[PDB]
Amino acid sequence: HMSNVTVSAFTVDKSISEEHVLPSSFIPGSGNIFPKFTSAIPKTAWELWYFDGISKDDKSSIVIGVTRNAEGLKHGGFKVQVFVIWADERTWHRDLFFPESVVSINESGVTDGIWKDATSNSSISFSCAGDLSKASLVFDVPGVVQGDMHLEALPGDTGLDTDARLGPSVYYVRPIGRASVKAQLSLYSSDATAAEQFSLGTSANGGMDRVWSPLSWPQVMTESYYLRTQVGPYAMQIMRIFPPAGSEDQPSTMARLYREGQLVCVAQHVVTRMTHDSLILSKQDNSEDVVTGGYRDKNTGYTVEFVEKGNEGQRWKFQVRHERIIWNTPTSRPGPDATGNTGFVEVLCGGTIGESYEGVGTGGQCELS
Template structure:
């Protein structure tokens, strides 16, 4: 029987304190899955274990984000955000609150809310890159920005999901099942993050993507910083080719990306992310926009791997909406968060692979 490791916090046991709490040290060459705040957290601390899965055609998807932080104390405790999508466009999403947060280190996630949700998610890494080579070797390599850590420890994932969800439709409550199988091309991604910094102090805009297309597996998180972080941008990106890690970037580049590349001024794996916005003068359909101030229809992503001296370009377009929720008061400058099934295409020069991704974008009303 495989060893199981566990970490638990109980919201009723005074585990949230008013003084700063520093995380446990980063462990080089490790997935760092165990809690970094094992006995208590401050009101700014947070930890994340996220599991996203989707079918090969993008018709089915299930995302689950497990948070250990103080944001939900007044509603009952720690929280999990769960979103499900079916082929007919039906979406079920809910934030669930729990007094106790228990993390068991296994290769699957099981959760149950009586009368609402019962689900099991099993992830299997298909990476041929050894874990030691796949994991960051230093805390700097694991940082999205100073003192904020994000990792994609499992790399490319074959995903299997079995879920039964009570969904209100046609004025009644009924049950729907959602099944994604690895044998039929189910894919996914796992995210591990933590910090003692509150979210608004380091980001006001974020985009996350996990995608599979042809021989490529891509996972990326890009943020734009706030006035509290001198508007510093940050990124964590990993690119696999035939399940082998070929690009590991924690550096983000601006519009001068290609000029600097040709001048050999780029010295480490680097990412450029550009939003694609609708052309107001075009009468042709241009894509699916967001519902808030950020009405982009997709992104263009470039990744440079210095060691391999290779450049990849991927075009990302919103294919199907999963969730859409405001983060500010309504209005023309209203902000929000949106989840998407993404249409992803590209590769190296001369390649044009096509595939599917699971994406999420966020804006919050912070300068």
């Protein structure tokens, strides 16, 4: 069969010991789209290909998580999460499991990932351009979800030339930091008999992340916050973790700010209250148009401050206000001290002194332990 095509194929109940492709860690300067844990896989290890978009014009949003975990090979296969919120705030979501996960780099350097099931004749696939100028997904799950999603990288710096370390145990790469996004799906009822049209609204921004660890989520974090947003000329992507309880580690971040497509703050440091680009990320608890997550964390937003290194480095400050709920999923038994994962339509305002540009973003907060 095929010539000059590098393939990693995972199939529930088949062994990966004879796979020819070698494992890798972080490749500097790269999108790191290809699987890291190839011919073996630490029992705890997992990998994520992440895609989202949100309409500034109507606050519709789509969030896709494509994963490949070790547990999967043994039982259950490989999870794809699809979450949608319409302009009118009605939501739709599925966790889909596929027995097969295949990622290929073809002779042209296009990377294709397909999560598929021969039994039900169903699949979800992603495709990334060699220069990461574009990516797209095709959803083909009869009776559940059909259609597609397109991401086009916006002009400017890629940020792929920055460090992707997120503490000692995770890498968080952003193959597409800043994209305009389009999506058209048929999302089916729980009984597969009816389908609703979802069209991602206009002036939509998003992007693609690529994330992996050899350790389980709880072993690397007790809490996380995700933000991706375009705010006038600004674009930012933030991931901030608090380490597992009884870790002596500092909080970690892989946080980036852009202005007119130029990278202006490369924050690998979270601080409270300058030798490095850093981030200050603080919770707020204060309009009528506020929501909180459905668990113990009742924050109504965050303040984001990026601080450029050095004497007379600039500062940019943004208010984030949780406005709409994309999801609430539990990470504990229910109760007053319950924890979970909440996705948000975030409303943003800010910039440097005297700027209050406005935009919207996808936000996500997760608490464990």
